[PDB]
Design a protein around this nucleic acid. Sequence first.
RNA 1: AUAUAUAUAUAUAAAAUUAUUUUAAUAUAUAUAUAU
RNA 2: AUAUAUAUAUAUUAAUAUAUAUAUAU
RNA 3: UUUAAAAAUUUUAAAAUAAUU
Lengths: 49, 1254, 139
Amino acid sequence: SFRVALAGWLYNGVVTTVIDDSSYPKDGGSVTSLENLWDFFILALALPL
Amino acid sequence: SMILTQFGPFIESISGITDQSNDVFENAAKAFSMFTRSDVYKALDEIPFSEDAMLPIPPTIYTKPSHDSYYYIDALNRVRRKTYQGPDDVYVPNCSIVELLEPHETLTSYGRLSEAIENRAKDGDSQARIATTYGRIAESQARQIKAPLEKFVLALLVAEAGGSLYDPVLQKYDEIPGLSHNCPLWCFREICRHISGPLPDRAPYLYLSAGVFWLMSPRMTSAIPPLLSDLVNLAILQQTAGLDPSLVRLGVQICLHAAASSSYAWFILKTKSIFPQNTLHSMYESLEGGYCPNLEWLEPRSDYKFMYMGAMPLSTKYARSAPSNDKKARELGEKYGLSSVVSELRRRTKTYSKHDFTSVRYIRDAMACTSGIFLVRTPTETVLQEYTQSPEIKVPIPQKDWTGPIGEIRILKDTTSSIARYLYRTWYLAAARMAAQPRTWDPLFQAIMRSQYVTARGGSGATLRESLYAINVSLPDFKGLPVKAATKIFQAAQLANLPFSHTSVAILADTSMGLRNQVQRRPRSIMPLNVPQQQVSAPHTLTADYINYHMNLSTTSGSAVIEKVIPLGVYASSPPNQSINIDISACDASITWDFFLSVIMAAIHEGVASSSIGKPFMGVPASIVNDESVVGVRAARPISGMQNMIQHLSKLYKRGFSYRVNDSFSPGNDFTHMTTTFPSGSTATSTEHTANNSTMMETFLTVWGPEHTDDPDVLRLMKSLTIQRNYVCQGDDGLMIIDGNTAGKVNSETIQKMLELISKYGEEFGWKYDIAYDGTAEYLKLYFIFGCRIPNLSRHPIVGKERANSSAEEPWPAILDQIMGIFFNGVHDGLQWQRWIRYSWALCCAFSRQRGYLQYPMWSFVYWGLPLVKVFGSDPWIFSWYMPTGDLGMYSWISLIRPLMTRWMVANGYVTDKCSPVFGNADYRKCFNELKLYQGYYMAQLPRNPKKSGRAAPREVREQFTQALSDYLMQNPELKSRVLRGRSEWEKYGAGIIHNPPSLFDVPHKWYQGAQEAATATREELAEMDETLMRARKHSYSSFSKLLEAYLLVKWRMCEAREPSVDLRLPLCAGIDPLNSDPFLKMVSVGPMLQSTRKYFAQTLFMAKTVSGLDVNAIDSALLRLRTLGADKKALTAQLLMVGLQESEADALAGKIMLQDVNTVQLARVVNLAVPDTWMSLDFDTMFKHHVKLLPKDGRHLNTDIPPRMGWLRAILRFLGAGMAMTATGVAVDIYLEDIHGGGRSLGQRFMTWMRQE
Amino acid sequence: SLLRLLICPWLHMEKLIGEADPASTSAEIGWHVPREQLMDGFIPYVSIRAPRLVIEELMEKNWGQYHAQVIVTDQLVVGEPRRVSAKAVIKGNHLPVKLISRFACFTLTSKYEMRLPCGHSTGRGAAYNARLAFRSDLA
RNA sequence: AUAUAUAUAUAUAAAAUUAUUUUAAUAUAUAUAUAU
RNA sequence: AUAUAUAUAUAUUAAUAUAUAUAUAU
RNA sequence: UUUAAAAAUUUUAAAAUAAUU
Ligand SMILES: O=c1ccn([C@@H]2O[C@H](COP(=O)(O)OP(=O)(O)OP(=O)(O)O)[C@@H](O)[C@H]2O)c(=O)[nH]1
Ligand SMILES: [Mg+2]
Ligand SMILES: [Mg+2]
């Protein structure tokens, strides 16, 4: 995932890389839950690439 | 004709025509005793069977080959069987038996193995050994019953001679075909005929105490005993359960095909799933209607609280959607020639399209037609087939994920890419939290865990002894002691004054073997671990327990099955919901060192390290060991006692286990065998299995599922499931509930795909999940479909009794317990109530007399629980079996008849001028003595087991034994200091109020006796019991017990039928329908059990834990005698100290005792009134609470008034109301208090003097 | 860890029994069958080497409470001493090392075989229910 | 080298969950009352 | 004549296999 | 001025019956 995201920077016009659907918190999540907090952390670090 | 001419009065008595009496009972019992087997088969000859019972019997059943070609001899001089098809054919074969027998001296038509063959085999011959093994194993297969089959058949003829019955509820004679439509009886008679032939003797073998004698006929084989047992079971079930005669024919056909094959047990084992697979697992491919329960599971699911909320109607959308079961079923049916039977079942099942009483009865009947034999095979075959299985680990832990060694253990690197890291984390956290608790560090908990496994059962003390001998260490022998030799008590007494470094060599010693057969499953296997090996395995079991009870918390262990487990299936099989059945095949063989035990031992060794840094565990030192877990560093690091034990346990688990097999069925087999299969005798077994099950399922759903499936449906299904809300497991088996969403039943393809993912998950680390998804629940051998429990009648064979050895059976009167158990097993399965009761009457006579005779009056059997029929000129069939057993049951059935009961007495002579408050003027004291009521009532209360007296061992060696045992119990200075301080304080203060105050010094004096009575009884004790029973029968009695006398002062009143507690169209248990009137009415008017109401006055003053050697009775009586007399608190504290408690803990318990005034413990100890067994399935709690009213119907009376400071009396009143209400047939009714002779205060004072006198 | 056990004890014993009498410092302990049943010959199963004072002590130990079914054959072996191969299966218990005390240097491996230096004729083989028995010379 | 009879001794068969039933004289004697 | 309870007194402690020795015969 | 709530504890150690892993 890391290397292919890095390689997709220079094929922007034919292929667009997105984060997988199954990485987002369950049912939208809720900040009353530790696991959803850490899911948000992982997403926030991973999205800019 | 014959049976009628013999005992017409008995036929009239038990069939609800003539009033019962002791004279007809004893005369019938005479007829049963003085009666021969030829008489049995002649009576069977008298039966004119119709064409309905007719059937074509295969002639191959009689001509069979010789046993020699089926066996051979191993390279290790072991005689073992030669499999011809598959590695399963290792059971007894079907062969001739006549050419190996020598004629018995008295009965010239019967005989056992020729002594020439046995002696020649003992010399060491090949053929002699093979022949003697075959003979002994065939005898063992023919010895798997509990009594001679002809006796059960005679009881059946006795019961059925009366004909049909009249139903007091339905108002008509039931339509159950007579014996002339009973094809099992026909096959029994025809087989016995064709085997006997011209010979006058008719029985094909006579079951005896020592061994079975075969009828010397060339038409004989080794398959006949099990075939006859099957036919007897099927006949009895068809007559007392109303199976239809269209499925009993199929059952008889399958039994015949089994008897006509190579081996019988093997065919029955391969063909054990044709009735369930074609009826239960294929129902309702098309629904049209019917009702199913609407249960709702309460929110903190983990506690298992339910609530019934009515019956919801079914519809077409809830039809069966699991995958089809057609191709595989027909393949199985074709491979064994049972294709016509399979097609008949598969056809007849497709005609039921409504969830109804009739369809559940169809399933019950189709599933009661499977054979219920105890499968048997030689021990050397079990040990060589089971124990050779090894795990199939397809993705092992990489070698680069283990650190260096720390003694005997390596640690998982924190950066492991495997799936074992979640296992490691779970066990690590569990071990840390277990060891952190301060409870696990006192001497009392240490001692309790030590004494947990010191029992009177064997532990293979020999190999322990001869392994300690190999390092030149001695052991006391205690010559001349009447105690059993192979008992863990004996080992513990030996190993008292021995350092751990000495006895630690006995941890690698081998284990002996145990065996046990079953119904429809291969013979069990067993291994008892010795005392050291049970000691060193303490952290494993403690961590498993902590995981089961606190961390994972998804299990039913430690919970009552009939209050929490039944309605789990009722909920998980209701239609909107679904159920998946998950089992682990060969669970023991799949837990080894390369995936489970290594990770678990590293985890438990690391977690305990923090809170046990220098302390000793249960008598284990604080040893040292060097570690290399960190690269470049190598330093000796101290460890703890609880880590030293893990070191030794790991060096045991790494090598595997060695089993010493020595079977008594094949002469010359005493080899030793070494496996890696996890033992089934360890204390830690049943807890660690369920812990591993729960852990792997949770790591499944949380990690492995979402990382290997792509479709959104399976992901959304695995994300909405958690092991605590959708999974229940106990040991090997398991259950996974899948709730129904709003769109209805969850889709089927997604559930299937998840199932194959689970199957692929098991193969990576060894396990082989046996998954079954077909629309029925499965848990602990309880079947459910659409919320209707379905009893499995084939699992409760009426005649079957298991004998894994060659030892003789316990002598009469030891069989009456088994007969009562047969009656109760019939009760819990919903058999036809009138037919089953009558058959049990007929059967409790045949086992009533035996040699100077001694006979039981029927009143004893009525005391044990069996309900009457027609006593005292009442109406036929008034009493149900739900009448409790003992004094409560006696009061119950008496009070409902008392007026007629006394007018009959006065109508036949018995009259006196004494107005008794109960029976008026009739003299019960003379008639009940005449009618033998007191005799049975007081003979039933006498024990039927030889009380093992002390054989007066020598004083020196007995003193030494008890002293060494006490030294083993109180090993550390802290327990001894506590108990000695307690004794000192007692002699300072408590001296005088008690003379032998119980402490931790009387525990060895109970272990010594418990070693005593594990031995064999002597002829002295048998003669003593016989003479005691005769004496108790030959007295003249004047009254009942004091408790029953006090009970009989209370009258009641049957006012109103309570409202229904369940719909009258909702099947809740197959077999309990309007055809079964009384159980149906009781179930529908009382309602099933969904609550928790345990412990109706089990109060006691001792609320703490101590060694298993002590008793609650002695401590409770001491505390009660010390609290009623009002002594100083220092006396209570001294007692609690010398019973082994801490100062602060003992004083908190003293404060407890000072609270909770003692008017309740005294009554709880004086009276013995409990909820009988049969009420466990019903809702008796609300019946106690709301529907037994102590304020009579028309208000106060001045007699039923109860004083304010006597509240315990309301308990006994609620007892008597509920019992008297449940005893009568029909619906349960509101019962009101009526009148207490004397008065409330007088009866209270009567109970209070008894409570005081303690 | 294994080769040290294999080699080291023999080198030390070679200093103690380097020059003593071989007849006085020697022994051998195998499975015994009586002079009958020829339709005495013992299979070695072990070869002890130790000083005389310990051979005297080993001469009196039990050595008889260990049983096994020996199955003699009639096959010949190419080796020099005329001997017939055999087999054996211990029954009940295995010989603990404590009997061969820490003062003798025994062997860890052995083949099962019997020598026939009398009336050379190999008849039919059989099983005999042997019993363990110490076997040294006069010493 | 063995066979039979006798006497003595020894070894072997587990853990857990659930529900039900039973576990404070051993005996006698004197004085008290009662029942048969 | 018997039994039950009341106070006291007294004595009181509670299947298969194998091994060994004797004897008789070969 | 009179009445009354009374304690619902445990995991109860062993021996027998039955069900199960
Ligand atoms: O005879 C044994 C039967 C099993 N139980 C205990 O149950 C646990 C699992 O028992 P098993 O391991 O025998 O079940 P299984 O694999 O044979 O299942 P199938 O292949 O037939 O589907 C083991 O841990 C054992 O201790 C024993 O107490 N008694
Ligand atoms: Mg199984
Ligand atoms: Mg099992």
